[PDB]
Amino acid sequence: KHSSDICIVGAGISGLTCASHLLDSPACRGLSLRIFDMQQEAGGRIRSKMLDGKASIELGAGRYSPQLHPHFQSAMQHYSQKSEVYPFTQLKFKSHVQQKLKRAMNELSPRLKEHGKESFLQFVSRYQGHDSAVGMIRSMGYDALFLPDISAEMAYDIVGKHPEIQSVTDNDANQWFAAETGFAGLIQGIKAKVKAAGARFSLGYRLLSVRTDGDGYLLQLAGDDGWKLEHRTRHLILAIPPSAMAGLNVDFPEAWSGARYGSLPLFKGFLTYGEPWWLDYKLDDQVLIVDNPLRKIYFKGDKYLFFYTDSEMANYWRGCVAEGEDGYLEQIRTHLASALGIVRERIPQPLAHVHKYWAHGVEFCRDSDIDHPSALSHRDSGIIACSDAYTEHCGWMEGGLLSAREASRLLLQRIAA
Amino acid sequence: KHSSDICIVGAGISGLTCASHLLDSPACRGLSLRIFDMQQEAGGRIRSKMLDGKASIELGAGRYSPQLHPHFQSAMQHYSQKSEVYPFTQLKFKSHVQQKLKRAMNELSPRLKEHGKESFLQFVSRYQGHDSAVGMIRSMGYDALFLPDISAEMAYDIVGKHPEIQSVTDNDANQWFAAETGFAGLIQGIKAKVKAAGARFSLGYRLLSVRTDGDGYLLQLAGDDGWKLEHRTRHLILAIPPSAMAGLNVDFPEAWSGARYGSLPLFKGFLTYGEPWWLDYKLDDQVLIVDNPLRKIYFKGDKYLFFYTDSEMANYWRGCVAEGEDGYLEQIRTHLASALGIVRERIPQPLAHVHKYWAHGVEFCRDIDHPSALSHRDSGIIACSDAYTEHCGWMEGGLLSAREASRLLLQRIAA
Ligand SMILES: Cc1cc2nc3c(=O)[nH]c(=O)nc-3n(C[C@H](O)[C@H](O)[C@H](O)COP(=O)(O)OP(=O)(O)OC[C@H]3O[C@@H](n4cnc5c(N)ncnc54)[C@H](O)[C@@H]3O)c2cc1C
Ligand SMILES: Cc1cc2nc3c(=O)[nH]c(=O)nc-3n(C[C@H](O)[C@H](O)[C@H](O)COP(=O)(O)OP(=O)(O)OC[C@H]3O[C@@H](n4cnc5c(N)ncnc54)[C@H](O)[C@@H]3O)c2cc1C
Ligand SMILES: Cc1cccc2c(C[C@H](N)C(=O)O)c[nH]c12
Ligand SMILES: Cc1cccc2c(C[C@H](N)C(=O)O)c[nH]c12
Ligand SMILES: [Mg+2]
Ligand SMILES: [Mg+2]
């Protein structure tokens, strides 16, 4: 095939801003840059859709706060991307159990200078009994907070920047916004700048092997339809997540950093109906955290509802789709009934649904706190890695912006000298 | 119960026909059926896309003959699929290399007796020279005729049985049809009737290995979101082509039949125009066969033109597509000008366009006693495919493997 000077692999937010920071630069004046990505679309873990053509839903990333995500807030304005207020940030539908939870929290919280590295299911079970420490906690909606892998210092953070449970830790100041056309509008924007700057895209292709040959690298990719493709570049950035690099011969994670990483599956499922039936309940633009397997239920206006799930519960939900769409849907009807506390047939059926499951949906720095380089180099061949996961904002979109802007710097200095 | 009675892996026309056979025996009145398929929609190599609204185009199988595909035709009827006449039978512009082989090829035809087990290229390299043979073979437009894997016995078969060059063998009377809506229309009908009888589809899952575990079998499949998954079933049919087969823990093809198998890539590219410009050259519903890369060029009423190639020239066009929409679009215009004997400025730029590379477009046969559906010696699995019939590379090959394989199975539920 062809060849290039720079070769970014991965074309989600970290990959595509990576490239645009390498083109804003004159130190790449008239240099050839190629982007490979696996999917037929650009976006990475960001995906937007129209179901029924009625309203624009988001199968992935959906929220940001300017208070907590400055570079992202700026990247929106930078690309004339119109935001809107994100409704799901207060709870009025609880039973008694989710109440009397902010009180248990604002009190046992500074008692964590003696119980901060421990996982979170016994920092709740050492300061009151277990038979009440699995109720205050699966009342907060994310089953991510029951896994041993990650702690009470990292969990007590995580409760404060998720719009639906932040009122619980002195953080209801922040506003949260959503893209008014969807975050694809932010992607189609960065994509156009990079094309106009003369880069060439190659979507459909997956990297398999890398070998370092003199001044540069020999990539072996494989097309979506089998086409075996070979390509050589002097300079290389793999802006893919950490799970993604485990599968390649790069010595991840050992040759690059002194941290390890996990990841949690996620699951979103969307439904729409003929008539906005949940309105009769004063439930539009509000959110319920129930302890049946739906976990969190959202109604955006009179338009649709969805439900968000994580970790194992996410696997559970991905199990009942392997079983059969119809089996998946009537059981949603079932759980929908015990949440709202009505009978099963007061619940209509959906004209059309749509659902998505993420196998490595959020990847995190597991050696939770460290130097936080924000980008990684090979101790040998000088390949730059680039993910949300290498920053203090593991699992958010601003981590992609930061990892990228850092990454592109290490390569500019690695070219110009 | 994450488990079932009968499992069919492969929702090609083979696999789905098996499902349709099986669900009409009364010996299956009360047995559960699972169909697995890698893709997110059934068909396999039948793939129809409504291009720009103002076109219905066939990226895979496109055409059939009532003379060689009667089981297909009866199926097309059995499901009220309206089919149209398929115009690409004559050649208006037969350069007299095409005409030279007309009456050079059909009279060493009894000389093909006591020969014909020999590369086709060295066959025609016996009447006239090498460079007279390659001129005759080039103008037939099927680069697969130059393979050594191919041989002059199959040669007179393949050239006889394609609608654009049948006029050169003696099967010049077969007639050829396409579908009003598309063969997708036909498979949606089988799938509808298979679903309605009670089969359960799990689409988007692909098989990785099979354990022969006791009564039946355990399968490992992997979805395209990455989710892993196990399935136990008692009766398993692999309705997938042989290339696929040779990548599992089943030892193919030695443990099945001894025969070796090969395949061919294929390419098709389509284009769309503001004004149908090829009508002023009286070119609608014609096909030009050419000695350049495009190879075969079709003009479809006033709707679209496309071109079609295989073997080396499919690999050449997949390799070009890989180097940018810009060059592929440009070489295409370069070679269309040579085809019509004009300058490239008379050829407008297209509005839309689409293309498909099939890595293993047609799979073929190459013991000469082979049934229409294979079986494992050791684990009692049955395989179902166009490739194990007298019709390898055709859809009717699929139907005659399904009816063979599906019956090979009631033979074993009457255990
Ligand atoms: C359900 C869900 C909700 C989320 N909500 C939010 C939110 O509200 N706010 C927020 O800030 N973040 C959110 N996120 C996180 C956000 O999506 C990611 O952190 C961010 O988009 C990651 O950007 P990235 O470009 O580095 O990686 P990715 O988005 O993973 O992009 C990686 C790209 O590299 C590609 N790639 C991988 N491997 C290979 C290979 N071998 N060859 C070729 N190509 C390859 C991938 O296909 C992908 O295109 C959410 C995530 C999920 C799953
Ligand atoms: C470009 C092209 C043009 C053609 N034109 C014509 C024509 O005009 N007339 C004609 O008669 N024939 C034509 N054919 C051939 C015809 O389409 C095929 O011979 C026939 O469709 C084969 O069907 P099948 O059911 O045997 O398997 P396939 O159609 O090959 O389908 C097999 C199915 O199994 C699935 N599958 C495979 N492997 C695995 C695995 N490991 N795990 C899980 N799932 C799996 C595949 O996704 C596929 O859906 C054409 C073929 C091509 C490529
Ligand atoms: C347990 C856990 C750890 C990191 C991330 C998540 C998300 C999704 C992401 N935090 C978001 O909603 O933006 C849900 N659960 C998580
Ligand atoms: C080399 C070879 C062997 C058998 C079959 C085919 C087809 C299929 C046929 N041309 C069609 O599209 O109808 C194309 N090439 C073939
Ligand atoms: Mg990326
Ligand atoms: Mg099949």
Whether the CB of B316 is below 8 Å from some CB of chain A: the reply is no
Ion ligand 6 nearby residues (CB, 5 A): B 10, 12, 14-15, 239
CA–CA gap between residue A32 and residue A239 (Å, rounded)? 18
Query: Which ligand 3 atom is nearest residue A364's CA?
Result: 4
Instruction: Copy the structure tokens of residue B364.
Output: 């073929």
Find where tokens 């950490």 sit: A242
Please state, as a whole number, how many other Cβ atoms lie within 10 Å of the Cβ of residue A20: 19
CA–CA gap between residue B43 and residue B30 (Å, rounded)? 27
Mutate to test the pocket of ligand 2, among B34, B38, B40, B45 (most ligand atoms within 8 A of CB): B45
Instruction: Copy the structure tokens of residue B181.
Output: 């809506």
Closest CA to A8 of A323, A184, A289, A235: A235
Q: Which of residues 1-40 of A touch B (CB under 8 A)?
A: 1-2
CA–CA gap between residue A1 and residue A222 (Å, rounded)? 13
Instruction: Copy the structure tokens of residue B213.
Output: 């575990």
Instruction: Copy the structure tokens of residue B406.
Output: 């599906």
Closest CA to A336 of A285, A290, A300: A290
A132: CB partners within 8 A, 6+ apart: none
Resolution attained, angstroms:
2.8
| Torsion B270-B272-B276-B280 (CA) sign | negative
CA–CA gap between residue A100 and residue A94 (Å, rounded)? 11
Chain breaks in chain A (C to N over 2.5 A) after: none
The helix-helix angle for B152-160 and B120-127 (nearest 10°) equals 90
Query: Looking at chain A, how many residues does it have?
Result: 417
Give how far the C-alpha of residue A374 lies from the chain's centroid of Cα atoms, to the nearest Å. 17
Q: Are A284 and A302 in contact (CB under 8 A)?
A: yes
End-to-end CA distance of chain B: 24
Instruction: Copy the structure tokens of residue A226.
Output: 């089998």
Instruction: Copy the structure tokens of residue B12.
Output: 């090609």
Q: Are A51 and A270 in contact (CB under 8 A)?
A: yes
CA–CA distance from B343 to each of B92, B179, B293, B335 (Å)? 21, 35, 17, 10
CB contact under 8 A, A358 and B205: no
Q: What method did the depositors use to determine the structure?
A: X-ray
From the CA of A147, which ligand is nearest?
A: 3
Beta bridge partners of A49: A57
CA–CA gap between residue A164 and residue A331 (Å, rounded)? 25
Instruction: Copy the structure tokens of residue B312.
Output: 């080396």
The helix-helix angle for B120-127 and B130-138 (nearest 10°) equals 120
CB contact under 8 A, B225 and A358: yes
CA–CA gap between residue B229 and residue A356 (Å, rounded)? 17
CB contact under 8 A, B324 and A200: yes
Whether the CB of B229 is below 8 Å from some CB of chain A: the reply is yes
Please state, as a whole number, how many other Cβ atoms lie within 10 Å of the Cβ of residue A105: 19
Closest CA to B155 of B133, B129, B177, B173: B133
Chain breaks in chain B (C to N over 2.5 A) after: 366
- The alpha carbon of residue B202 is apart from the nearest alpha carbon of chain A, in Å, by 7
Q: Are B101 and B140 in contact (CB under 8 A)?
A: yes
Partners of residue B226 in chain A, C-beta under 8 Å: 359-360
A310 lines ligand 3 (CB under 6 A): yes
CA–CA gap between residue B14 and residue B389 (Å, rounded)? 12
Find where tokens 């009145």 sit: B29
CA angle A44, A45, A46 (to 5 degrees): 90
Domain boundaries, chain B: 1-415
Partners of residue A356 in chain B, C-beta under 8 Å: 225
User: Before B148, cis peptide (omega within 30)?
Assistant: no
User: Before A253, cis peptide (omega within 30)?
Assistant: yes
Question: Residues of A marked as binding for substrate?
Answer: 63, 162, 308
Mutate to test the pocket of ligand 1, among A7, A45, A376 (most ligand atoms within 8 A of CB): A45
Q: Which helix (H) or strand (E) holds A177?
A: strand A177-179
B357 is annotated as contributing to ligand binding: no
Tell me the H-state helices in B341-376.
none
CA–CA gap between residue B320 and residue B179 (Å, rounded)? 31
Q: Are B32 and B197 in contact (CB under 8 A)?
A: no
Find where tokens 């073979």 sit: B137
Q: Are B328 and B339 in contact (CB under 8 A)?
A: no
Residue A179, Cβ density class (10 Å: 0-12 exposed, 13-18 middle, ≥19 buried): buried
Whether the CB of A379 is below 8 Å from some CB of chain B: the reply is no
Say if strands A228-238 and A3-9 run parallel, antiparallel, or are unpaired. parallel
CA–CA gap between residue A375 and residue A383 (Å, rounded)? 10
Residue A87, Cβ density class (10 Å: 0-12 exposed, 13-18 middle, ≥19 buried): middle
Residue B268, Cβ density class (10 Å: 0-12 exposed, 13-18 middle, ≥19 buried): buried
Say if strands A286-289 and A296-300 run parallel, antiparallel, or are unpaired. antiparallel
HSE (side-chain half, CA atoms, 13 Å) at B392: 22
Query: Looking at chain B, how many residues does it have?
Result: 415
Whether the CB of B202 is below 8 Å from some CB of chain A: the reply is yes
User: Before B253, cis peptide (omega within 30)?
Assistant: yes
Instruction: Copy the structure tokens of residue B348.
Output: 């407008």
One-letter identity of residue A374:
S
CB contact under 8 A, B200 and A324: yes
Instruction: Copy the structure tokens of residue A328.
Output: 């998946």
- The alpha carbon of residue B315 is apart from the nearest alpha carbon of chain A, in Å, by 9
User: Distance from the CA of A239 to the center of ligand 5, in angstroms?
Assistant: 5
Instruction: Copy the structure tokens of residue A334.
Output: 């079932």
CA–CA distance from B406 to each of B15, B22, B148, B294, B401 (Å)? 9, 6, 35, 40, 8
Whether the CB of B356 is below 8 Å from some CB of chain A: the reply is yes
In whole angstroms, how large is the CA radius of gyration of chain B?
A: 23
Question: Residues of A marked as binding for Mg(2+)?
Answer: 12, 15, 239
